[PDB]
Design a protein around this ligand. Structure first.
Ligand code: MG
Lengths: 592, 1315, 49
RNA sequence: GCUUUUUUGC
DNA sequence: TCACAATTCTAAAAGCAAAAAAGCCTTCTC
DNA sequence: GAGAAGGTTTAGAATTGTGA
């Protein structure tokens, strides 16, 4: 039965390889038996015994020696050893990694209304995973008498099974797992919430942990059965008990892109807006001004706020005062938990500012307020990001006026150096290096020109003479606020996209003077392709090597457990801040 | 000019560059090759003629009875393409070759044949290429992808610095033949010259020379120049050429003519040799110390003792010098050896070798090749002669010979494929020359070294292999048997040839299953060149440099279309204009530019030949006659973009569209995307699934028309004419008489295809696109296949997108769709699923198909005929019954989930089983449609004959009134004179008779073909196939994309009352996230959105001025104004030549936005987009001001709306969802099955176990790999406990562990568990 | 669970122990593997005492 | 219910 | 003797998923 | 027809080939 002969479809039998090898060895043993019985001459008995030795050598470990035996197909057949070793033997395929019941798979989409510990699970899938629990509760409630009747009832989907299912789904965590589970946070327990649809709805704030956007990914959900399993999912894995990375201290609930844009745009300031300068009794008045159109979400306003400093040991002490903020910062203040100080929400909240704000919440107050705070931050970010209507158009990326002149001057300079080479006064290598240098200079100059143009583009007047403020451009906001992108990408979108590297590392001597809001001619695009294909090949052929490295590391260090309280030794390591020639790279505080 | 079918919708066409060469026929790559494969070929260089001429004539061991070649013919298919798909059998043709066996006489080299026996012998079928480039092997439609490999030749590689751990530069010289053995010459850190064959054990090089009829003197003469020492009265005066001294030190006093020319201690330089040659120095004295440092060239033997004085290639020492000095010989030949300009590599190699003679060389090679067998002189001689110098076993292809000669700077291109001694020694000398410093290595990425196979060449090689196996068989048999008795066919038997061809086509790494869910998918699955396959590299061993893009792929291979994944850069796609050379190498066209004037003669340039010239740039402004307006133009001289003067150019590029494949040329504004986004867009536009009602792009590139027509999807007219009868199932076109043949009174019938399954389970139908009485000219479409619209290529719908964040329902890549799109079925598709019931004859009772089913009531029986089979048109759901079949309960149940009607049933039964009643009904139905359709094929010919009778029967005793009394037939026996008129009447009667005969003779065969059974699998009664046809809607989870790589998964279907609405009331239809664009820099999508808004604004203006009727004058004025807008736009449509009825049809085809064509790299600009926006009434910035549906308040920050073209990719959420609670388990290891077809469970791989260990969840892990998976008694107890109400487990121990335990035990390794 | 067995008419060498590289039998009998496999495959005679 | 080949998604 | 050092041979090369098609010995014979 | 029936890319360890 460990090598079955299964009648395939209709009328034929599929013989496993081992049956072939055993048949061959039995045949050739019978031949040797007869030959030794008849006492044949020496040469043929030698040949027969040799070839029996060969048949067994193929049986136990095929193809170890030359001329691996092949069956019907041209390929070698699999022996015992090849049935144990390798990536398809029992050790890596059926013992360490098993297929598992009570488990489904589906696309993941975004449900932006769930709480940080919930996942929307479809009704069809959920009803199919929790079938035995449904049978149990039907039997216990008596609505069906026997498992046959219960099975028919669930298979026909009467009107009662839905309320039964909503009962058996109440406090029953389910493990969501994304395909290449890379680190500890790729498996997480979640509270199901039944959904009508066929996609698993996954709270946005956990995507970063999973490294999962919604370009059509897929997750597998497993169900814990027993009580230890349910408590373990609830106490160890649940998505609220995992808000710090294990590899370092940094939190793993950084609000990512739309929410950070909403908070940034909300909590900004502009030198003139509706309702500038008035005084508001508190945050609530700020909200009911902004919601009625009488003032702008960001207009400079004095507001009377009360912050709770907990200087008293485990006791909050209130402090009332007047602050200079905007309507946006007061509205956002309405959600921050008690013990925080007001200066923590009183600047344009980028991504770093928000992440440290969550970190300080976690540090001062603990866990539960931080979970509530992360939820409220997501909701407010999404709402006011939507209300901003922050869109992107072609006019939101402006070529600097000076780029024409800069590129013309660099053209003149390279013409001068080329003429210098025509006279032989400059060696080839020096000519090349100097051309590269002047082009790098031109690129830097034009990039700074466009950044100066964008970063303060807006010019506006309060009641008279003009004034300069940071610019409300859409793409500048997308990059500055940390939402999505950096300065290099915006440089390519507006200023010239520098020089490009031939695949051998050589830098070509003709930069791409044309950005993307203008065209690239055919040749510039071809050069860009050199650059891009290199990177794609890198990722494709690097994922495999990384996986192998991680496998080796785990299979070495898979025995360390923390077993004792103090081994009682005085040795150690002398840690000091590291210095790589220049300044101190890693300071002592982070080191120790 | 304009057609009368391209005049229904004219694409307002931006783009300034007037292209000269039209886009070629995109399928030529495979059509031409397989045309060459089968062609009755005089002079037989390629095709089957080449194979037969190569393998024949066959000669026995002077058996005086030999066989030769005459001719070969391909018969006709037993089945045309469509019934080959319907049935399942290969669309083939039989091959018949005219063999001729001739029996000589005794002692008859001069003796005439005594017997000649000739016939056609039948050897096997060969599959044929349908007119679309595809093959039909067993019903399914396969494509034999091209292959890119290394052209045979000689290649001098470096192995630059990654050897010996000291930065040495080895050098290698490989010979790659077309069929034979690789021969490699290579170097060693110790500076030896080694050889190897077949990459197996290595040897000193010179041994092969020792095997080529050589002695050491010849070798030394070959690879060295001699230096003359002359023993003289004063210490060996020496004869010196000045040029042998450059870059050397002064080891002595260079003196002559009683004068010291150069002194010791200094070093010889250029001026020194200048002084020497000016003075014409002949001989120079030198001390013996320098003479001691050379090696003797020739073996020197004493004239007295007849014994060796000094053998060759050994250092001359003072002792040997003394011994030979008095030997009497005054001339010594040594070897010039400068460590820079030369090297004695062959000398040390001759030191190393263990051989001395030809016998030693041959035995060494033979021990090298086949160990175990002791050497034999004759066997080794035969082997080394057969390994390289027997054309039957080794062969450079003619391309191989061309590359071989070109590399070695030879002068002819023709040659002989068998190697020669001269060629080997010349390769050796070239390799050494590279080593010395002169000459440079050849890389392997160059498209000069890489060569395209095809269906023709691959098929020829397979047929040749089969045929040489067969000629071996006939040769073996022909030396035996009585010759005069046997006809020349009873020895071939044809089995190997058919076996080989069928095996290559059916199952090969390149003859692969067709991608058929578009016209684009097919037309770009055919122009694919694959680096892989037999005779090519492989994905794992595939390097990292081949995957990169060489600077010479410009114009030959696309840079931005390659499937990322394991094989990225190994599967290339062939560029638009690229054609293949006479040899295999890729050309691209180029305009000839003699002087500054850019002449209009196009020359195709290959890969190697493209480097020498300096080729201008496709977009270099020229002013109406062809002078490059600019002073410094750009060019690409030799793989190096550079800047050249106004006149150095020797070629220009044909078109700006020539660097990109077809699939990447349908993306508008390609020159604004990043390269990665362009790649992903080109790759997803090939997965778009065709929807119910096709919609034109509305921002295109003008390549949609060519792509749509250049696939075989659309039924295009062969001879123009006037439509005569249109229908959803056929079209009948009356050919214009001018184009008509001299006779046969032809018309054209087109049988549109209706609701058939594609390979990917999609619906391929064809809708007529012409009205009745409509004139259709030659080459104009009639039927719009899937995703086609008026002969364009409509892959998706154009939807009103707005870019903004909307409550995080479009967070990362998600899309937020309106319910207005689900309502209208914009993205609804039709899938067709072919289920099969195979009715075998099992034991314990031969099976049946009776409708009688035990153990069922009437719920399942209410959807069946009395034979059990389902009525065609019956909606079914999961778990129903479709075919009646019970055990002596194998009834084909509808698998779970698959739904929808049953559009088609087909039953094949083998000859021998009585057809059942529904088989009777179906075959009778098919017979009736056959008879009807092939009576419809009768036409006005007979009526024309009757009219001819009437014209000839004008009078002469004729009843003019009674002509129409009786039917027109009896017009022959009526009264007539006795002249030629009566003879003509009899001739018309004869015509009538043979008309009956000719139509009846053809009509009979259909009875035979329909009636007969067909070849099933042995043992099966009949195959019954049902065809369900589900219809998929859109829903959350369904993946959607644009053309610029901006994919995403639908997240919410939002009610129309909630979408943002601009002030005019019109709700937005999709909402996309802006935050995507700046990071993944695809600015193409924004520009497409703005141009779409402009175009739909123009279309709205036309629809307003048309619906609220205004006279045609205003319409022609406005349409003309829209068609002018621009600058140097090359189109220039003249609208005053339409006659106020073509304008009305046109303007009725423009009420849904005016289409635009924006070619790939010289598309529209910002300024012209703004102009077009102004021509409507829309704001110029592109951004309008939107209101929020849910709250009605206005959005700050104006938002970007427009019309973007959205596709629907074939990754549907309902084919991905899957769940399992308990099902069936595998047999060996009792673990759940894997897959969605099987009710399978999700794998819990290793990495997830590591995650669980890291958390510390030990109980979850234990229940995860003991109960839920594998412990049999444990999981049954678990199920029982769960149903009961108690949540607990008794784990036990796996049953996939005991398997391992026993398999290790069945080795000799006792493994056991202890206390 | 129930196995079976086959009685070889003559002895035979276990490949795993013979050519594990390093080889157990080889360095247990202090004599190379080329000749050991040559003897095993009936191509030489090996003396004992 | 097993092996291979090909393709595609992440 | 006994030591480098060159040649040979074995071991490995991410994970999950879906689809599709192939497929199960030559010959020798009554 | 069909039953018989013998059929790359690197690295690490191990050998032996001069070279002392
Ligand atoms: Mg993704």
């Amino acid at each position: 039965d460990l090598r079955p002969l299964v009648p395939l479809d209709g009328g034929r039998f599929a013989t496993s390889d081992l049956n072939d090898l055993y048949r061959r060895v039995i045949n050739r043993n019978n031949r040797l038996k007869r030959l030794l019985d008849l006492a044949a001459p020496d040469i043929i008995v030698r040949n027969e015994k040799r070839m029996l030795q060969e048949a067994v050598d193929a049986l136990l470990d095929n193809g170890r020696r030359g001329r691996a035996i092949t069956g019907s197909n041209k390929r070698p057949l699999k022996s015992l050893a090849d049935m144990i070793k390798g990536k398809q033997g029992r050790f890596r395929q059926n013992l360490l990694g098993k297929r598992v019941d009570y488990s489904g798979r589906s696309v993941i989409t975004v449900g932006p209304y769930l709480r940080l510990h919930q996942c929307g699970l479809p009704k069809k899938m959920a009803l199919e995973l929790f079938k035995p629990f449904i049978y149990g509760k039907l039997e216990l409630r008596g609505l069906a008498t026997t498992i046959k009747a219960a099975k028919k009832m669930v298979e026909r989907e009467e009107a009662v099974v839905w309320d039964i299912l909503d009962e058996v789904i109440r406090e029953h965590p389910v493990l969501l797992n994304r395909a290449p589970t890379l680190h500890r946070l790729g498996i997480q327990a979640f509270e199901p919430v039944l959904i009508e649809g066929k996609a698993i709805q996954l709270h946005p704030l956990v995507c970063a942990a999973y490294n999962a956007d919604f370009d059509g990914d897929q997750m597998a959900v497993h169900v814990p059965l027993t009580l230890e399993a349910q408590l373990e999912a609830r106490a160890l894995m649940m998505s609220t008990n995992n808000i710090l990375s294990p590899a370092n201290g940094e939190p793993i609930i950084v609000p990512s892109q739309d929410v950070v844009l909403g908070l940034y745009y909300m909590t900004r300031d502009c030198v003139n807006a509706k309702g500038e300068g008035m005084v508001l009794t508190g945050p609530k008045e700020a909200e009911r001004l902004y919601r009625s159109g009488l003032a702008s979400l960001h207009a400079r306003v004095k507001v009377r706020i009360t912050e709770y400093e907990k200087d008293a040991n485990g006791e909050l002490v209130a402090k009332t005062s007047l602050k200079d903020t905007t309507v946006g910062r007061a509205i956002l203040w309405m959600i921050v938990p008690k013990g925080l100080p007001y200066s923590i929400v009183n600047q344009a909240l980028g991504k770093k500012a928000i992440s440290k704000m969550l970190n300080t919440c976690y540090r001062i107050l603990g866990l539960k307020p931080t979970v509530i705070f992360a939820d409220q931050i997501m909701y407010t970010g999404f709402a006011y990001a939507a209300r901003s209507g922050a869109s992107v158009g072609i006019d939101d990326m402006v070529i600097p006026e000076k780029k024409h002149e800069i590129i013309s001057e660099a053209e003149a300079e390279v013409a001068e150096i080329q003429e210098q080479f025509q006279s032989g006064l400059v060696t080839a290598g020096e000519r090349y290096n100097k051309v590269i240098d002047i082009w790098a200079a031109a690129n830097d100059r034009v990039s700074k020109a466009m950044m100066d143009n964008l970063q303060t583009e807006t010019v506006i007047n309060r009641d008279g003479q003009e004034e300069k403020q940071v610019s409300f451009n859409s793409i500048y906001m997308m990059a500055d606020s940390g939402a999505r992108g950096s300065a290099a990408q915006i440089r390519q979108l507006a200023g010239m996209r520098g020089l490009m590297a031939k695949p051998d590392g050589s830098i070509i001597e003709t930069p791409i003077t044309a950005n993307f809001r203008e065209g690239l001619n055919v040749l510039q695009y071809f050069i860009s392709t050199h650059g891009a294909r290199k990177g794609l090949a890198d990722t494709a052929l690097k994922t495999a090597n990384s996986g192998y490295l991680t496998r080796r590391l785990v299979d070495v260090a898979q025995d360390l457990v923390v077993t004792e309280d103090d081994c009682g030794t005085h040795e150690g390591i002398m840690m000091t801040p590291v210095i790589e020639g220049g300044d101190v790279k890693e300071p002592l505080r982070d080191r120790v | 000019v304009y057609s009368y079918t391209e005049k229904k919708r004219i694409r307002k066409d931006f783009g300034k560059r007037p292209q000269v060469l039209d886009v070629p026929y995109l399928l030529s790559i495979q059509l031409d090759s397989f045309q060459k494969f089968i062609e009755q070929d005089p002079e037989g260089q390629y095709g089957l003629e080449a194979a037969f001429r190569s393998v024949f004539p066959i000669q026995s061991y002077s058996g005086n009875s030999e066989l030769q070649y005459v001719s070969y013919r391909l018969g006709e298919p037993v089945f045309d393409v469509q019934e080959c798909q319907i049935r399942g059998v290969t669309y083939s043709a039989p091959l018949r070759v005219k063999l001729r066996l001739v029996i000589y006489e005794r002692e008859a080299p001069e003796g005439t044949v005594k017997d000649i026996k000739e016939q056609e012998v039948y050897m096997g079928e060969i599959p044929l290429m349908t007119d679309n480039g595809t093959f039909v092997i067993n019903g399914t439609e396969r494509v034999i992808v091209s292959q890119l490999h290394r052209s045979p030749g000689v290649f001098f590689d470096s192995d630059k610095g990654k050897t010996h751990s000291s930065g040495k530069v080895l050098y290698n010289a490989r010979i790659i033949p077309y069929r034979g053995s690789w021969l490699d010459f290579e170097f060693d850190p110790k500076d030896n010259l080694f050889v190897r064959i077949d990459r197996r054990r290595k040897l000193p090089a010179t041994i092969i020379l020792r095997a080529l009829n050589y002695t050491t003197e010849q070798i030394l003469d070959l690879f060295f120049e001699k230096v003359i020492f002359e023993i003289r009265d004063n210490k060996l005066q020496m004869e010196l050429v000045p040029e042998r001294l450059r870059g050397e030190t002064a080891s002595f006093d260079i003196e002559a003519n009683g004068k010291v020319y150069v002194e010791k201690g200094r070093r010889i330089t250029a001026r020194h040799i200048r002084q020497l040659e000016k003075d014409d120095v002949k001989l120079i004295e030198v001390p013996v110390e320098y003479i001691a440092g050379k090696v003797v060239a020739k073996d020197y033997i004493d004239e007295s003792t007849g014994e060796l004085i000094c053998a060759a290639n050994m250092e001359l020492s003072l002792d040997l010098l003394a011994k030979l000095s008095q030997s009497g010989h005054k001339r010594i030949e040594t070897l010039f050896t400068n460590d820079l300009d030369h090297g004695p590599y062959i000398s040390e190699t001759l030191r190393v070798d263990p051989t001395n003679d030809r016998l030693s060389a041959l035995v060494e090679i033979y021990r090298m090749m086949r160990p175990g067998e002791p050497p034999t002189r004759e066997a080794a001689e035969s082997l080394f002669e057969n390994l390289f110098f027997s054309e039957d076993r080794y062969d450079l292809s003619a391309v191989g010979r061309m590359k071989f000669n070109r590399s070695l700077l030879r002068e002819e291109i023709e040659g002989s494929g068998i190697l020669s001694k001269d060629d080997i020694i010349d390769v050796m000398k070239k390799l050494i020359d590279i080593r010395n410093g002169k000459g440079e290595v050849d890389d392997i990425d160059h498209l000069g070294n890489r060569r395209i196979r095809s269906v023709g060449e691959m098929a020829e090689n397979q047929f040749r292999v089969g045929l040489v196996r067969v000629e071996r068989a006939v040769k073996e048999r022909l030396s035996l048997g009585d010759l005069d008795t046997l006809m020349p066919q009873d020895m071939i038997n044809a089995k190997p040839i058919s076996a080989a061809v069928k095996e290559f086509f059916g199952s090969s790494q390149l003859s692969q299953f067709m991608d058929q869910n578009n016209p684009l998918s097919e037309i770009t699955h055919k122009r694919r060149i694959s680096a892989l396959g037999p005779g090519g590299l492989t994905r794992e061993r595939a390097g990292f440099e081949v995957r990169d893009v060489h600077p010479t792929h410009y114009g030959r291979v696309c840079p931005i279309e390659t499937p990322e994944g394991p094989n990225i850069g190994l599967i290339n796609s062939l560029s638009v204009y690229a054609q293949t050379n006479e040899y295999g190498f890729l050309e691209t066209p180029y305009r000839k530019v003699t002087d500054g004037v850019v002449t209009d003669e196009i020359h195709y340039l290959s890969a190697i030949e493209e480097g020498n010239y300096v080729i201008a740039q496709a977009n270099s402004n020229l002013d109406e006659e062809g002078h490059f307006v600019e002073d410094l133009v750009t060019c690409r001289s030799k793989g190096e973009s550079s800047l050249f003067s106004r006149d150095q150019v020797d070629y220009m590029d044909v078109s700006t569209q020539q660097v990109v494949s077809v699939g990447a040329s349908l993306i508008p504004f390609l020159e604004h995307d990043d390269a990665n986004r362009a790649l992903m867009g080109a790759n997803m536009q090939r997965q778009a699934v065709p929807t119910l009602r096709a919609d034109k792009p509305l921002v295109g590139t003008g390549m949609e028309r060519a792509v749509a027509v250049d696939s075989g999807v659309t039924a295009v007219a062969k001879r123009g004419g006037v439509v005569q009868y249109v229908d959803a199932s056929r079209i009948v076109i009356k050919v214009n008489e001018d184009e008509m043949y001299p006779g046969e009174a032809g018309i054209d019938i087109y049988n549109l295809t209706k609701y058939t399954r594609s390979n990917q389970n999609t619906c391929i139908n064809q809708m007529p696109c012409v009205s009745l009485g409509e004139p259709v000219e030659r080459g104009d479409v009639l039927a719009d296949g899937p995703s086609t619209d008026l002969g364009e290529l409509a892959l998706g719908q154009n939807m009103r997108v707005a870019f903004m964040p909307w409550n995080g329902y479009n967070f990362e890549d998600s899309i937020l769709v309106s319910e207005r799109v689900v309502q209208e079925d914009r993205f609804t598709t039709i899938h067709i699923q072919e289920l099969a019931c195979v009715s075998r004859d099992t034991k314990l009772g031969p099976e049946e198909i009776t409708a009688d089913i035990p153990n069922v009531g009437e719920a399942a029986l209410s959807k069946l005929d009395e034979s059990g089979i389902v009525y065609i048109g019956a909606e079914v759901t999961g778990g129903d019954i479709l075919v009646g079949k019970v055990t002596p309960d194998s009834s084909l149940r509808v698998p779970n989930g698959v739904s929808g009607t049953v559009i088609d049933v087909q039953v094949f039964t083998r000859d021998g089983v009585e057809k059942d009643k529904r088989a009777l009904e179906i075959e009778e139905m098919q017979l009736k449609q056959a008879k009807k359709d092939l009576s419809e094929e009768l036409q006005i010919l007979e009526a024309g004959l009757f009219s001819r009778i009437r014209a000839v029967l004008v009078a002469g005793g004729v009843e003019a009134e009674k002509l129409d009394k009786l039917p027109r037939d009896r017009w022959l026996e009526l009264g007539l004179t006795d002249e030629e008129k009566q003879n003509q009447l009899e001739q018309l009667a004869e015509q009538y008779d043979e008309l009956k005969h000719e139509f009846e003779k053809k009509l009979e065969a259909k009875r035979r073909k329909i009636t007969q059974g067909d070849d099933l699998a042995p043992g099966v009664l009949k195959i019954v196939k049902v065809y369900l046809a589900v219809k998929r809607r859109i829903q959350p989870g369904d993946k959607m994309a644009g053309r610029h790589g901006n994919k995403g998964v639908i997240s919410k279907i939002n009610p129309i009352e909630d979408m943002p609405y601009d002030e005019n009331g019109t709700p937005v239809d999709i909402v996309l996230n802006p935050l995507g664009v700046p990071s993944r820099m695809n600015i193409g999508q924004i520009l497409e959105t703005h141009l779409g808004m402009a175009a739909k604004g123009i279309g709205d203006k036309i629809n307003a001025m048309l619906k609220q009727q205004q006279e045609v004058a205003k319409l022609r004025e406005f349409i003309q104004r829209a068609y002018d807008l621009g600058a140097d736009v090359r189109q220039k449509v003249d609208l005053s030549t339409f006659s106020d009825e073509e304008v009305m049809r046109l303007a009725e085809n423009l009420r849904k936005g005016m289409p635009i064509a924006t070619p790939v790299f010289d598309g529209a600009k910002e300024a012209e987009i703004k102009e077009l926006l102004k021509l409507g009434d829309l704001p110029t910035s592109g951004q309008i001001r939107l209101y929020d549906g849910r709250t009605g308040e206005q959005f700050e920050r104006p938002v970007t709306v427009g019309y973007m073209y959205m596709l629907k990719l074939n990754h549907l959420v309902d084919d991905k969802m899957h769940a399992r609670s308990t099902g069936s388990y595998s047999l060996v290891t009792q673990q759940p099955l894997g897959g969605k077809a099987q009710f399978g469970g999700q794998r819990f791989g290793e990495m997830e176990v590591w995650a669980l260990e890291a958390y510390g969840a030990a109980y979850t892990l234990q229940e995860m790999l003991t109960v839920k998976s594998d412990d049999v008694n444990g999981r049954t107890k678990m199920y029982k406990n769960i149903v009961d109400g108690n949540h607990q487990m008794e784990p036990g121990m796996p049953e996939s562990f005991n398997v391992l335990l026993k398999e290790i035990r069945s080795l000799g390794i006792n493994i056991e568990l202890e206390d | 669970e129930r196995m079976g067995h086959i009685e070889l008419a003559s002895p035979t060498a276990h490949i795993w122990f013979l050519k594990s590289l390093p080889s157990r039998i080889g360095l247990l009998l202090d004599m190379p593997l080329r000749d050991i496999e040559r003897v095993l495959y009936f191509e030489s005679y090996v003396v004992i005492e």
